[PDB]
């Protein structure tokens, strides 16, 4: 949910993308500039939904 | 026969040769005015 409006943008191969379209999506806008380390989420499921991987990367 | 655009073609075909002319004229001339060896 890149834009923080609960409208998930899937950007990975296994979820319908190809090399050209696929991408790692930016952290949520709900998050803004806040630090979002994995240990800041109730779960990974929550972390992958708010674009946690983006920051770690 | 010889329509307006046909006349223009000549005008450009003639105005073209002239340019090639004066150019090779001037050139061939100045060329033959120095080159000693």
């Amino acid at each position: 949910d890149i834009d923080g409006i609960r409208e998930p943008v899937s950007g990975s191969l296994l979820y319908g993308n190809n090399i050209i379209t696929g991408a790692v999506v930016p952290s949520s806008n709900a998050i803004g500039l806040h630090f979002y380390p994995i240990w800041e989420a109730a779960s990974l499921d929550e972390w992958l939904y708010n674009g946690g991987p983006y920051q770690l990367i | 026969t010889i329509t307006p655009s046909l006349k223009g073609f000549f005008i450009g075909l003639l105005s073209g040769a002239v340019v090639l002319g004066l150019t090779f004229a001037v050139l061939i001339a100045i060329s033959q005015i120095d080159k000693v060896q």
Binding site: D3, G4, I5, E7, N29 | -
Partner: protein
């Protein structure tokens, strides 16, 4: 035979005639507009892109605080006040299309301040 073999890793002298190089290039344009100093050549070779990209990076870092590009929208106007378009305006339309369509559902208000 591959023209490449004509070079051995760990050579003492040079593998090309930098004087013949300069000789040709100096004649293409004109002598003083050509390098003969390999060191000055290579400095330029590095200086140019690095300096240019430095500015491009400062551009994105600068437009990160909303100091954007030149805005010549409706600059040239005629004797009555009518707006005479320039290519700068045709560019604005293409920009509006992008503005007006990006992030469909994310905006709730008039001005895009974010």
């Amino acid at each position: 035979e591959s023209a490449n073999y004509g070079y051995k890793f760990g050579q003492e002298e040079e593998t090309y005639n930098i004087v013949a190089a300069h000789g040709y290039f100096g004649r293409l344009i004109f002598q003083y507009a050509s390098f003969n100093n390999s060191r000055s050549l290579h400095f330029f070779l590095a200086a140019w892109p690095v300096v240019g990209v430095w500015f491009t990076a400062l551009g994105i870092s600068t437009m990160a605080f909303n100091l954007n590009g030149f805005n010549f929208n409706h600059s040239v106007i005629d004797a009555k006040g009518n707006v005479i378009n320039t290519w700068a305006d045709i560019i604005n339309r293409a920009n509006l299309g992008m503005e007006v369509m990006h992030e469909r559902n994310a905006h709730n208000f008039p001005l895009d301040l974010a």
